[PDB]
Write a protein that binds this ligand. Structure first.
Ligand SMILES: Nc1ncnc2c1ncn2[C@@H]1O[C@H](COP(=O)(O)OP(=O)(O)NP(=O)(O)O)[C@@H](O)[C@H]1O
Ligand SMILES: Nc1ncnc2c1ncn2[C@@H]1O[C@H](COP(=O)(O)OP(=O)(O)NP(=O)(O)O)[C@@H](O)[C@H]1O
Ligand SMILES: CC(=O)Nc1ccc(CC(=O)N2CCN(c3ccc(Cl)nn3)CC2)cc1
Ligand SMILES: CC(=O)Nc1ccc(CC(=O)N2CCN(c3ccc(Cl)nn3)CC2)cc1
Ligand SMILES: [Mg+2]
Ligand SMILES: [Mg+2]
Lengths: 352, 352
């Protein structure tokens, strides 16, 4: 049985795969071809079919797990393509989490004798986050922040120590947003959530610009000016409003300049992409800040795949949390941000 | 000098006008034609030019104000048309609030000898809200709620007593959203705000559907199904997720089903209008709930013109605040919700 951990989300399936590297002579002989073909197929390819991808840069090398040494691999593909994944399987114990572990339970059971063990999303994310930080990212920090996020000539990624990680506010940006308060290794709760998440960015961006992928949406946003679509404080007051500490550059109304027909006719797709990204990211930051104040937690870590190859949103979150909290809150990021549920699922394997 | 109160917002100008009804014989003789022509023009018309409207149903009759009896009138027009308003004036003491009192200060001063007194938006809104509730709406309650908002066969508008209105959370939904905590008649603060407000609804709706007015956007939304665009909890799990108390009907990702090209090709403009309305309204409710919990305030009153002729959003707010707060928070509404800043400005007249 290959060791796999699976997180079946609304948008992406994330898979963690432990590749043993201490295979003895006797162990190699006493393994079936189907297993050897799986291990070679996964380790000799970085693209699987048309839509599967191995994130090679995230691999943890020479990890000791369950008394064996091996490499931990991180693989993703669209949930829309799970039927292809299951069909390839039909031609073992699977620990699975995410909503799809429930939605697709019956489909996994079409693989003969497969034991499906559905694991709680919250337990998986927390256990996987604590585990990866504890083993380190091949000796480097798993957690980082943007130092001096207020000044762009100084703003720089820097490591952050989570050896005592409690308490922690975890903001999981997937299709929607879930916000978790973690008080200890066995004391954590879902605080609330918001439906304005990564699927809102991608869905609205696709409607507004015709982009066909997440990466294209980000590329458009990198070229745009959100202020062509948004109504700013200075658009309403003529400048700053210091009475309530609002700088003139703050957004007063997202897409608010689009009530004017002449402005809708002049706005570019790139402007609209950037306004969508800014709108969603600022709302996530603000909800995170309000939850952190209510939970009395000053460390806010962001996870999920909305922030994958998305430095714009990461820097916007770092700047916004620091600015609007007057320096009381710190935005934290993790290298394996999309995969903690899949790792936590894999870590449940000894229980079965 | 006619008695006027003006709130110049990012989208609409709101005007409160006190029409004296106790004019004596000597007072009528000793009034200039320009004044008599203004009073007759305002009281004999309900539409002013192409874009001005008198909200006749809101008129307060036989009010005693500043030692005189009169009628209080409520008038609105688009801020885009303020140049026409000022040009009509060029062919007195004006108490004005809103961002436009600052932005357009120099324009008002093109009216010879006009004294412009800019008044704080927060002071104006609070004073005007407390004043209107205190004088009543022609003997009826100014404040109401939706009783039994969970069951549609029973959900009904009912009066709410604000004789002791403190503490109160005021959610001002204009172009953006401002959230105020009111602890006493002289102790109140702006808690925070969100840029996802009425201008976001109108601007995004116009981009997505081509609607040309707020009223058309609402009419489209009344015919639509937001679930064609939104990804629900049941879309991700296959049903409810009781582990975190999430019903299957809850929105997990606003516009989240629009990441699929075939769904973007089948969605109607009415569906998109309704999803925009639901997205913006739920986000406002959630931010209001989080602020109410942090401020330890259980009465949340919604004002602004986003809710004008918008019963869908009002009922959604009433249902959502009650449901997600497990009955700890009550959504409150006010008949004069768009005009409290203009009234509060008028009430500043004795200070000048
Ligand atoms: N290759 C990609 N395809 C689609 N979306 C992507 C991709 N890369 C990054 N994203 C973004 O990542 C978000 C999904 O993040 P992810 O954490 O994998 O969520 P999910 O688990 O699949 N959904 P959920 O059920 O809400 O937990 C999408 O909404 C996009 O904004
Ligand atoms: N006739 C209308 N024209 C435009 N918008 C309308 C109209 N009626 C209702 N609305 C809605 O009301 C919102 C404006 O509300 P309002 O409270 O008057 O804000 P504002 O004061 O002009 N803006 P702000 O500067 O943010 O305080 C718009 O964003 C629309 O969603
Ligand atoms: C995998 C998964 O489950 N994803 C998920 C599921 C749900 C959500 C949204 C959420 O958590 N919601 C909905 C909005 N809410 C409101 C709304 C109006 C008010 Cl007045 N108050 N709260 C709070 C509760 C986010 C992501
Ligand atoms: C007439 C008027 O002034 N309208 C107005 C002005 C401003 C706003 C928005 C607002 O108040 N903002 C901006 C978002 N904010 C964030 C953002 C990211 C984080 Cl991390 N935290 N907070 C909080 C402060 C709303 C309406
Ligand atoms: Mg997920
Ligand atoms: Mg206003």
């Amino acid at each position: 049985s290959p060791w796999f951990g699976m997180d079946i989300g609304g948008t992406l399936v994330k898979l963690s795969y432990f590749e043993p590297i201490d295979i003895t002579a006797e162990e190699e002989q006493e393994e079936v071809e189907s297993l050897k073909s799986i291990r070679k197929y996964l380790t000799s390819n970085v693209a699987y079919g048309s839509t599967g991808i191995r994130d090679v840069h995230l691999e943890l090398k020479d990890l000791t797990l369950f008394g064996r040494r091996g490499n931990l691999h991180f693989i993703r593909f669209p949930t829309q393509d799970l039927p292809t994944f299951i069909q390839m399987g039909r031609d073992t114990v699977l620990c699975a989490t995410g909503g799809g572990a429930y939605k697709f339970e019956k489909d996994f059971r079409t693989i003969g004798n497969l034991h499906l063990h559905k694991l709680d999303e919250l337990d998986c994310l927390v256990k996987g986050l604590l585990y990866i930080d504890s083993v380190s990212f091949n000796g480097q920090a798993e957690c980082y922040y943007f130092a001096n996020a207020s000044e762009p000539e100084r703003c720089q990624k820097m490591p952050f120590n989570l050896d005592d990680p409690y308490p922690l506010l975890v903001v999981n940006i997937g299709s929607g947003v879930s916000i978790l308060a973690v008080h200890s290794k066995d004391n954590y709760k879902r605080v609330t959530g918001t439906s304005l998440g990564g699927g809102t960015f991608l869905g609205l961006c696709s409607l507004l610009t015709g982009c066909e992928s997440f990466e294209e949406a980000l590329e458009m946003a990198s070229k745009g000016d959100s202020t062509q679509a948004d109504k700013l404080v200075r658009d309403i007051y003529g400048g700053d409003y210091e009475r309530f500490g609002l700088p003139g550059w703050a957004v007063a109304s997202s897409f608010g300049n689009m009530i004017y027909k002449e402005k809708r006719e002049s706005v570019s797709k790139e402007d609209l992409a950037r306004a969508t990204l800014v709108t969603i990211t600022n709302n996530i930051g603000s909800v995170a800040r309000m939850c952190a104040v209510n939970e009395k937690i000053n460390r806010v870590v962001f996870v999920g795949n909305f922030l994958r190859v998305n430095t714009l949103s990461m820097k916007l979150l770092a700047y916004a949390l620091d600015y609007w909290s007057k320096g009381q809150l710190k935005a934290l990021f993790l290298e394996h941000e999309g995969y903690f549920g899949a790792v936590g699922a894999l870590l449940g394997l000894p229980n079965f």
